[PDB]
C-alpha cells in the first residue's frame, strides 16, 4: 500500500473482492485499478477513484492522459507509486496488475509530483 487509500475506507473488503473478481472475468484484457492522489501532494485531484484500463496501456501513456485530464503541466513532475515503487514508464498496467494486485482483485496506484514520496 503506497498510501492510505480512501477507496478502502469507504468500501468493505468483500464488496471490493466480489466486484474485482467479476470484472476480471468479464473484461480479461482490462484490469481494475484504484488511482488516488497522495494526500499532501499539491496537485490536481481526480474526480473518480475507480478505473478499468487496457492491460496493454503503459504507465507513460497513463501519465499523458492524466496530464490532459487534470491539466498537470508537461514540464511538471508526475509519478505513480505501487507498493511504494515507481513503475517504469514502459511498464504496462497488465504487468503491474499481475505482480501487484491486492487480494480484493484491484491494483492500487498512488500519484504525486514528489519523486521521494513515501
Amino acid at each position: 500500500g503506497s498510501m492510505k487509500f480512501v477507496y478502502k475506507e469507504e468500501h468493505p473488503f468483500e464488496k471490493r473482492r466480489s466486484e474485482g473478481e467479476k470484472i476480471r472475468k468479464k473484461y480479461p484484457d482490462r484490469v481494475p485499478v484504484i488511482v488516488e492522489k497522495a494526500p499532501k501532494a499539491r496537485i490536481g485531484d481526480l474526480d473518480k477513484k475507480k478505473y478499468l484500463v487496457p492491460s496493454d496501456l503503459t504507465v507513460g501513456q497513463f501519465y499523458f492522459l492524466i496530464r490532459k485530464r487534470i491539466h498537470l503541466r508537461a514540464e511538471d513532475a508526475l509519478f505513480f507509486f505501487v507498493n511504494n515503487v515507481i513503475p517504469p514508464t514502459s511498464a504496462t498496467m497488465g504487468q503491474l496488475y499481475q505482480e501487484h494486485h491486492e487480494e480484493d482483485f484491484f491494483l492500487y496506484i498512488a500519484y504525486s509530483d514528489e519523486s521521494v514520496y513515501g
Partner: peptide
C-alpha cells in the same frame, strides 16, 4: 502501446 483516450479507462 496503442493510442488510448480517457474514455478507454472508464469503469463500465
Amino acid at each position: 502501446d496503442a493510442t488510448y483516450t480517457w474514455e478507454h479507462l472508464a469503469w463500465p
